[PDB]
Amino acid sequence: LERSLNRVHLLGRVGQDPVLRQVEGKNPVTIFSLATNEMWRSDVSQKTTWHRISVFRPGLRDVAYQYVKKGSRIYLEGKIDYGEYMDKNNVRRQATTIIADNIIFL
Amino acid sequence: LERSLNRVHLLGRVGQDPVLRQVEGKNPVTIFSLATNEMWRSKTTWHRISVFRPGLRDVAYQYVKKGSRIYLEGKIDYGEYMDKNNVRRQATTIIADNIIFLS
Amino acid sequence: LERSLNRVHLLGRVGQDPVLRQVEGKNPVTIFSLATNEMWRSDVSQKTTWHRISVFRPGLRDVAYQYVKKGSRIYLEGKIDYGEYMDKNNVRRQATTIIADNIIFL
Amino acid sequence: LERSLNRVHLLGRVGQDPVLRQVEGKNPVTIFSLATNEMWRSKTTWHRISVFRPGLRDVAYQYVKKGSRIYLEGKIDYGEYMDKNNVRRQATTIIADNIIFLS
Numbered sequence: 001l002e003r004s005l006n007r008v009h010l011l012g013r014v015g016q017d018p019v020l021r022q023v024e025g026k027n028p029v030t031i032f033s034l035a036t037n038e039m040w041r042s043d044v045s046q047k048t049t050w051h052r053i054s055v056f057r058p059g060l061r062d063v064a065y066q067y068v069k070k071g072s073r074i075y076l077e078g079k080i081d082y083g084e085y086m087d088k089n090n091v092r093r094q095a096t097t098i099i100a101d102n103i104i105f106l
Numbered sequence: 107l108e109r110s111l112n113r114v115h116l117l118g119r120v121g122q123d124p125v126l127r128q129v130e131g132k133n134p135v136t137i138f139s140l141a142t143n144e145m146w147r148s149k150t151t152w153h154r155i156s157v158f159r160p161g162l163r164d165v166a167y168q169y170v171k172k173g174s175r176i177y178l179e180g181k182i183d184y185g186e187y188m189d190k191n192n193v194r195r196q197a198t199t200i201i202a203d204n205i206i207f208l209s
Numbered sequence: 210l211e212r213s214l215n216r217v218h219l220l221g222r223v224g225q226d227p228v229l230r231q232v233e234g235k236n237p238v239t240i241f242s243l244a245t246n247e248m249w250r251s252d253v254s255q256k257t258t259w260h261r262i263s264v265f266r267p268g269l270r271d272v273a274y275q276y277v278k279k280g281s282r283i284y285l286e287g288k289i290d291y292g293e294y295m296d297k298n299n300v301r302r303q304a305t306t307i308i309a310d311n312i313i314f315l
Numbered sequence: 316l317e318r319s320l321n322r323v324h325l326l327g328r329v330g331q332d333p334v335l336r337q338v339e340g341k342n343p344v345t346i347f348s349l350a351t352n353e354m355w356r357s358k359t360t361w362h363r364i365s366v367f368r369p370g371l372r373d374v375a376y377q378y379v380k381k382g383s384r385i386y387l388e389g390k391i392d393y394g395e396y397m398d399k400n401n402v403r404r405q406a407t408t409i410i411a412d413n414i415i416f417l418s
Contacts, residue, residue, distance in 0.1 A: 002175075003312050004118040004142035006151055008182070009324070011111035011386060011414055036110040038181070049112060049184065073416070075326070075386065079144075080114060080153065080182065082197060093195040095184065103212050103326065105384065105416050109414040111386075115218070117284070117312065175314065177220060177284065177320075205220055205318040207282070207314050211384075213327040213351035215360055217391070220320035245319040247390070258321060258393065288353075289323060289362065289391065291406060302404040304393065 006079040008097050010051060012036040014072045018055075018065050030055040030065040034074065034097075053078070054096040064102060075103040112181045114199050118142040120174040121152060124167050129158075136163040137198075138170055140178070155180065156198045169206060179203035215288040217306050219260060221245040223281045227264075227274050239264040239274040243283065243306075262287070263305040273311060284312040321390045323408050327351040329383040330361060333376050338367075345372040346407075347379055349387070364389065365407045378415060388412035 018032040034051040053076065055064040068074060076099050083094025121139040129135055136157045143150040155178065157163040170176065178201050185196030227241040243260040262285065264273040277283060285308050292303025330348040338344055345366045352359040364387065366372040379385065387410050394405030 004144070005115055005177075005312070006118075006142040006144065006153075007115040009111055009113045009115075011109075013108070036112040037108060038110070038112070039107070046107075049182070051112075051182070075111070080151065080199075082151065093197055095195060095197050103214070109412075111414065203318075205320065213353070214324055214386075215327075215351040215353065215362075216324040218320055218322045218324075220318075222317070245321040246317060247319070247321070248316070255316075258391070260321075260391070284320070289360065289408075291360065302406055304404060304406050 008078050008080055009075075010034055010036060010053075010078075010097060011075045012051070012073070014068055014070055014074055015050065017070045018068050020065055027056070028061065030061045032064070032068055034076075052096045053099060054081075055099045057100070060099060060102065064099070067104065068102075073105045075105065077101045113179060114182055115177075115179055116140055116142060116153060116199065117177045118153075118175070120170055120172055120176055123172045124170050126167060133158065134163055136167045136170075138166070140176060154196075154198045155201050156183075157201045157204070159202065162201070162204060166201075166204060169208070171208075175207045177205040177207065217287050217289055218284075219243055219245060219262075219287075219306060220284045221260070221282070223277055223279055223283055224259065226279045227277050229274055236265070237270065239270045241273070241277055243285075261305045262308060263290075264308045266309070269308060269311065273308070276313065277311075282314045284314065286310045322388060323391055324386075324388055325349055325351060325362060325408065326386045327362075327384070329379055329381055329385055332381045333379050335376060342367065343372055345376045345379075347375070349385060363405075363407045364410050365392075366410045366413070368411065371410070371413060375410075375413060378417070380417075384416045386414040386416065 012034045015033040015035050018030050021029040021031050032053050036049045038047045055061045078097040078099040081096050081098050084091050118140045121141050124136050124138045127135045140153050141150050157166045180199035180201035183198050221243045224242040224244050227239050230238040230240050241262050245258045247256045264270045287306040287308040290305050290307050293300050327349045330350050333345050333347045336344045349362050350359050366375045389408035389410035392407050
């Protein structure tokens with residue numbers, strides 16, 4: 001009955017060296033953060049936004065983990081997943097971009 | 107200086123009828139939610155949208171109604187704030203483009 | 210050694226009812242055209258561009274062929290293929306967007 | 316009025332060192348070609364880019380050099396003209412965004 005789209009194109013510099021996350025015994029992730037900048041025209045006034053990148057999928061997890069280093073420019077595509085975790089009845093965010101593709105610019 | 111990309115493309119159903127909010131003293135924003143959802147072989151994602159753009163916010167107030175199918179493009183903002191010495195997120199996609207599927 | 214990208218996101222109204230192209234005995238295509246508009250800010254002055262859409266792939270060819278009608282709003286993704294055909298030694302264009310995906314907005 | 320999308324995203328190697336051209340009497344454009352290519356299991360596509368934008372064209376003249384890897388976004392223009400009572404195409408992607416991969 002219906003298709004939706006949740007797509008994110010991000011191109012920026014990696015802020016830190018990636019961490020292989022294997023807490024307790026769940027399905028593993030490669031976590032890194034990407035820096036995106038933004039100058040405002042309303043004038044050269046800027047801002048820098050930090051994206052928590054998560055790499056699920058057996059293909060890209062390992063390749064992201066060994067080759068992505070701090071300072072690398074990366075292009076990627078993924079989907080916005082808000083990390084909706086409960087606390088005391090209600091909920092709050094732990095948002096990630098979950099990667100489907102990275103092109104390394106080198 | 108170093109060029110970046112921060113683009114989200116969304117297409118889904120509007121979940122709520124838009125609310126006119128105002129950041130700080132004066133800064134007009136229209137806010138709604140949009141559902142997108144994806145299916146596995148054994149999840150609805152709700153996104154808050156902020157249309158701060160001088161004219162796009164007016165149009166989206168006038169014409170975005172709950173359950174509408176919309177296409178939009180924007181940039182992600184994690185909206186980090188301290189509720190009480192504790193970092194939190196108020197993540198929003200600030201919409202720049204917006205193609206409305208109705209008449 | 211290297212990845213490139215040739216991607217096109219087009220959202221617009223279909224100009225004519227699609228034609229199943231099977232000239233002589235080649236691999237079949239579903240051809241339709243999409244209308245994209247463009248207002249210029251430099252002021253409400255407009256322009257309308259016509260895209261020759263081509264649908265290869267056994268999945269989408271038939272589905273594009275039966276369901277896409279004149280006047281339908283369609284969203285699609287494809288790649289720019291210039292129809293480089295020779296004449297008398299040199300070459301000229303017959304450009305198509307070759308579709309990989311259509312979302313019908315209904 | 317009816318909103319549309321006409322967006323191309325390209326990433327490839329620049330094939331030629333940019334030429335400063337001028338449409339009609341006065342309208343500055345920088346033009347280069349970009350190769351993208353895709354591989355089948357048994358093709359280079361050459362695109363002409365026009366940067367007409369007041370400042371982006373200057374930057375791209377200064378800094379686009381042959382063989383550079385570039386990322387760009389633009390809108391397709393089929394450039395239809397009559398050479399002699401016969402319709403022809405001069406297809407170009409008019410670039411709006413342009414993220415340069417060098418220093």
